[PDB]
Amino acid sequence: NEKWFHGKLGAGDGRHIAERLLTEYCIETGAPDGSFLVRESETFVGDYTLSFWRNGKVQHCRIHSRQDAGTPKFFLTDNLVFDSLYDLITHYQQVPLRCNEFEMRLSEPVPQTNAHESKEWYHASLTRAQAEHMLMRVPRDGAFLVRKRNEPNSYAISFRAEGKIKHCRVQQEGQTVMLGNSEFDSLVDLISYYEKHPLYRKMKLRYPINEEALEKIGTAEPDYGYVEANPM
């Protein structure tokens, strides 16, 4: 499901963010040479760049994108042309890339750590009091949100459990997120697990809260009523 596709990386700092992302994944996990990602190009409108690992250095290759006869054509060199980025990546995963100086096959994909950012339950800027206030407006067990904390790589799941509002501390520790001692690959994956399994005393993550969700359910400032999550 396009794990290696990162889209736009802020602005056209995108090259440096790619490099950072790759150095982080490759050094923490001990990834092989050829570990990569695809993102939008900084210099070439409508093209992409394939950024990959080479023993501490990262190589950038332009993936030219044509619309010829209303049929997208992604390619690295005029000689070999593809129909999808999946085919190109999957082909260069098997056949080695020719880059003049060296040759290299694409290895493992470097995944995004920030898919949570677009999710409805995610607030990049919400104090604990602001989470509590919004959670008081939803008198429902299972109502939740994920809020970013002031420190980098630190979050909280703020939820309504048995009428009270409690808070769980989540920590991004490199390429995984930690909830106490429980480890997940991402904040997204943690939330999916806790939508199916109880986060705190038989309470699952049921209703994601934001301003739109409040217009639907939500009331007008009612009920004036950190915690350990369930392991596994």
Residue 152's Cβ-count burial label (10 Å; 0-12, 13-18, 19+) is exposed
Spatial separation of the C-alpha atoms in residues 154 and 152, rounded to whole Å:
6
Q: Tokens 């909830």 — which residue? A: 179
Q: Where the chain is broken, by preceding residue (C–N > 2.5 Å)? A: 12, 225
Resolution (A): 2.4
Selection from 111, 76, 113 nearest residue 95 by Cα: 76
Determine whether domain 115-232 maps to CATH 3.30.505.10.
Answer: yes
Phi-psi region of 153 (alpha: psi -120 to 50; beta: other; left: phi over 0): left
Elucidation method: X-ray
Q: Which fold has domain 1-114?
A: SHC Adaptor Protein (3.30.505)
Start-end of CATH 3.30.505.10 domains in the chain: 1-114, 115-232
Distance, CA of 103 to chain centre: 30
